[PDB]
């Protein structure tokens, strides 16, 4: 029962070189190099699904701050204002509203200003 | 009852080990021997 390996080994290597398309030099041509590149791609990919959720919130916060200060209040007080007014609109939605409807956002600044005074 | 409808008693044909065949098997590398020393070697170990 002699087993020749050529057919199975090609299929296994081809899967890897396929995952490595777009990489530079040997990393998209040479199995040994590609294999290390594809794993590391996976390592980073896992990690940055966690990181992605961090980066977006920092962006929303940063934008609300600018728009809050435009209506004459700091981020820290505006959020506190909304909490004591029991407004629960999150920062994804608030940063969206900060950009596309400045008049609705100003109305949320008053809502949060009334509660805070 | 045909020659392709007969199958073994449950639990009666345990698959047994195949060492040195990679991470997934759980016994790839070293082969359950640990690292180094007399017990790890080819032919290696002490008498009765």
């Amino acid at each position: 029962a002699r087993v020749k390996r050529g057919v199975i080994a090609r299929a296994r290597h081809k899967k890897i070189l396929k995952q490595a398309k777009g990489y530079y030099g040997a990393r998209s041509r040479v199995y040994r190099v590609a294999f290390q590149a594809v794993i590391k791609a996976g390592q980073y990919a896992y990690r940055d699904r966690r990181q992605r959720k961090r980066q977006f919130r920092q962006l929303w916060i940063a934008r609300i701050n600018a728009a809050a200060r435009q209506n004459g209040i700091s981020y820290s007080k505006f959020i506190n204002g909304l909490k004591k007014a029991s407004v629960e609109i999150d920062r994804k939605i608030l940063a969206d509203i900060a950009v596309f409807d400045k008049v609705a956002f100003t109305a949320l600044v008053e809502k949060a200003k009334a509660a805070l005074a | 009852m045909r020659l392709n409808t007969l199958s073994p008693a449950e639990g009666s044909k345990k698959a047994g080990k195949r060492l040195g065949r990679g991470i997934g098997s759980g016994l790839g590398k070293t082969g359950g021997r640990g690292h180094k020393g007399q017990k790890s070697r080819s032919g290696g170990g002490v008498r009765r």
Binding site: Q43, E88, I93 | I23
Partner: protein
Amino acid sequence: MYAVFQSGGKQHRVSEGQTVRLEKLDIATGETVEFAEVLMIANGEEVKIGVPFVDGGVIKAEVVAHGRGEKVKIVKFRRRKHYRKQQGHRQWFTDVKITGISA
């Protein structure tokens, strides 16, 4: 006119005719859902929440599709410790079309 509502443990800003992708809802793909907990309604004028949720505010919507998102590969790898894994994931979703914003 748009509105804000909660459904997938997350919030969405939507208008009439818009399709929005939510977490899985146990509803057949021709039936109608109502979202009766709405965080904001804005038209010419805009009624926002005080108590969380708008009092008279209801959003009605039609379930259009169930399905799964494109597959993602999970890799774990501990260098020099002869350890690795891989795994697949597809996340469920329901798509709904907003047919009514009731103010």
